[PDB]
Amino acid sequence: PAFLFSGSTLSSYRPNFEANSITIALPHYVDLPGRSNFKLMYIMGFPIDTEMEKDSEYSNKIRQESKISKTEGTVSYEQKITVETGQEKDGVKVYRVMVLEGTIAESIEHLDKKENEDILNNNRNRIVLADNTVINFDNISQLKEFLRRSVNIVDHDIFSSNGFEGFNPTSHFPSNPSSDYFNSTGVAFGSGVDLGQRSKQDLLNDGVPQYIADRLDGYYMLRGKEAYDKVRTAPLTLSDNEAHLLSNIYIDKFSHKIEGLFNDANIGLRFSDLPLRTRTALVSIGYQKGFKLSRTAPTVWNKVIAKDWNGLVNAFNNIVDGMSDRRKREGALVQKDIDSGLLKLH
DSSP states (O other), rough: TTTOOOOOOSOOOOOOOOOOOTTTTTTTEEEEOOOOOOOOETTTTTEEEEEEEOOSSSOOOOOOOOOSOOOOOOOTTTTTTTEEEEEEEEEEEEEEEEEEEHHHHHHHHHHGGGGHHHHHHHSSEEOOOTSOOEEEEEHHHHHHHHHHHHSSOOOOOHTTSTTOOOOEEEEEEOOOOOOOOTOOBEEEOOOOOOOOOOOOOHHHHHHHHHHHHHTTTSSSTBTTTHHHHHHHSSSSSSHHHHHHHHHHHHHHHHHHHHHHHHHHHOOOOOGGGHHHHHHHHHHHHHHHOOSSSSHOOOHHHHHTTOOOOOHHHHHHOOSSSSSSSHHHHHHHHHHHHHHHHHHHHO
C-alpha cells in the first residue's frame, strides 16, 4: 500500500522491544495478548496486519465481515477498537494498524492528525472490533462519522425531534390543571428540561455553564400556577445553541441513570451493548415517564430485562397513556434494530 509507514500509530499495546538488541531493523512478531486470531508484524515501529486465504505462519486467517452498517451503525462506547488502513486482493489483505485497541475518543483525535492524512486518503479503511469481525468503510470521513456517532449514548437528533421529546427553546409549561402533575410541573426549556424542582446550583452541579444557569434565574422552582403565570407574563427564550446545550446535558444525565439501572439488573449484557436506536427508545420513554422504568413502565422494563426484543416492541405498542403515537414510534425504533439484525432474538 502507498504511504504504508507514513504518519503515526496510536497503541494501548506496548510491545517491550528491548533496546540494544541486534534484531532491530528485523520484523518482530507478537500475538495480541487478549486475542486470537490476531498476530501482528512490527516493521520499523509499525504494526502490520496481514490476512491470507492461503495459510502461512506470520499471517492471519480471513476475518469475518461485521453486520454493522458503515453508514448508520455504531460500536459499543465501552469497547476498544482497532482501526486499520491498507489494501486487499485475491484473498490477500495487507493492513497498517493506525489505532491498536484504542478508545473511540482517542481514535477520533488520532485520525484527525495532519500526519495521517496521506495514508488514510490513499487506502481502504476498516475497523477490527473486539469480536474480530471487521467493518469496511468507503472513505475515512465515513469512518470518522461512524466513530462520532458511536460516542453518543442516544441519538440526540431523534430524541429532540417532534415525534419524540420535541424541542422548544422558549420557556413553556407542558401541563394543565386537569393533570395530577400540574403542581409537579415547572417551567421547561428546550427538550423537556424542567426547572420546577431544580435550583441554579443543581444545574451548575450537573455541568451547565454558568452563563446559561444565570440566564435562567427567575424560572427556578416555579411550579403549577406560578410556572404557568410566569411563562404567560414573562417568558424567556434561549438561543437554539444554548437550549440544545442545556437539553443534551439532561438527556445524557438520564441516559446514564437508565444505563445504571440496566446494568444493575444483570441482564447478560450492558446498556452499551444495545444498538443506538434501542438505547434512544428506552431513554425516550424513561425521560418522559420517569427513568425508573420498573415503576413507570413495568411492561417495557420486564421485557428489557428478559432480552425479549419482540416482546419489547409489543410492550411499547400496548402502553396505554395518552402518548400512544410516541410510544409506537419508540417501539418502531426497537423493531428497526431487530430488522437490521442488531438485537439477537434467541
